[PDB]
UniProtKB/Swiss-Prot annotation:
Organism for this UniProt entry: Staphylococcus aureus (strain Newman)
Superkingdom in the source lineage: Bacteria
A single cellular component GO annotation: extracellular region
Gene Ontology biological process terms, A to Z: lipid catabolic process
Protein name: 1-phosphatidylinositol phosphodiesterase
Length: 303
């Protein structure tokens, strides 16, 4: 059976000698927004409908968590100003559970501040993440704590690998875990060196594009990954796009065109390097269209 027919443990089927950068990994953009039910607000703030555990079951391994410091010991998951009805502990417990049940998968967790801290907060978002999550004895062993800048699948599986969008950090393991952090350019395709120059990060995050220009930006980066066998290069390609302006000009609406379109392209390419592709409505299927998550999964080679 091709890898996508068992999306719950597809990483277990790969060679764990690979660097995670070389693996083609599906991600979910604003992973935690499956909690939104308000139909007006969901048009622009809702980007998923499957919970964390279902996303993981359908094969998602890169989770995009953006949050807000809501107390000196607490981070809330958010889409900008919109609170997604749970705290970061919730994603961490679900991940731990999942990783316990499927011990040969790794999760990459992107952490970003999306909104101003509660007025009672006296500490930085980075400091609260570092002290009350990363170093919290409660989540002991959950995170990747190695000193490898380019970790392999063997040394991370069973664990969450931090992908640091918080700015400079005193955290020392995972991508961008140094006091420079990741220099992220707004609404752009860009490249920046991370981890004391060990890695070359290549990002297409043109989140305000109209869909047609989005496809073209997604494809351009896709075609760069294809012919790049450098393991020190890491590709992050966001399919997802901001809402257009009316009702039913929704992120869903665009994803329903972008996903099948990109999924088609990856499939026609066979087993080429794709990078990490971060999507809205991961695991949402339309009768008669290629599935983006499945196609990312199957683009990985098996030797
Ligand atoms: Cl809501």
């Amino acid at each position: 059976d091709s890898l996508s027919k068992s999306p719950e443990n597809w990483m277990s089927k790969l060679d764990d000698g690979k660097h995670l950068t070389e693996i083609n990994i599906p991600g979910s953009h604003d992973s935690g927004s499956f909690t939104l039910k308000d139909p007006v607000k969901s048009v622009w703030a809702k980007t998923q409908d499957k919970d964390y555990l279902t996303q993981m079951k359908s094969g998602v391994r890169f989770f995009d968590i953006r949050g807000r410091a809501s107390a000196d010991n607490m981070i809330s998951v958010h889409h900008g100003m919109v609170y997604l009805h749970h705290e970061l502990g919730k994603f961490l417990d679900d991940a731990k559970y999942y990783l316990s049940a499927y011990p040969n998968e790794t999760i990459v967790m992107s952490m970003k501040k999306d909104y101003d801290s509660d007025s009672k907060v006296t500490k930085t978002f980075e400091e609260i993440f570092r002290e009350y999550y990363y170093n919290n004895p409660q989540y002991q062993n959950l995170f990747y704590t190695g000193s490898n800048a380019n970790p392999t699948l063997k040394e991370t599986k069973g664990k969450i690998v931090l992908f640091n969008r918080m700015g400079g950090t005193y955290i020392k393991s995972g991508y961008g875990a140094d006091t420079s952090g990741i220099q992220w350019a707004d609404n752009a395709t860009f490249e920046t060196k991370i981890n004391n120059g060990s890695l070359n990060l290549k990002v297409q995050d043109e989140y305000k594009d109209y869909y047609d220009k989005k496809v073209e930006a997604v494809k351009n980066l896709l075609a760069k990954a294809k012919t790049d066998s450098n393991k020190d290069n890491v590709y992050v390609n966001f399919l997802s796009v901001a809402s257009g302006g009316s009702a039913f000009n929704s992120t869903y609406y665009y994803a329903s065109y972008i996903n099948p379109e990109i999924a088609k392209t990856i499939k026609a390419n066979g087993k080429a390097r794709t990078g990490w592709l971060i999507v809205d409505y991961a695991g949402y299927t339309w009768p008669g269209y290629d599935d983006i998550v499945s196609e990312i999964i199957d683009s990985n080679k098996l030797e």
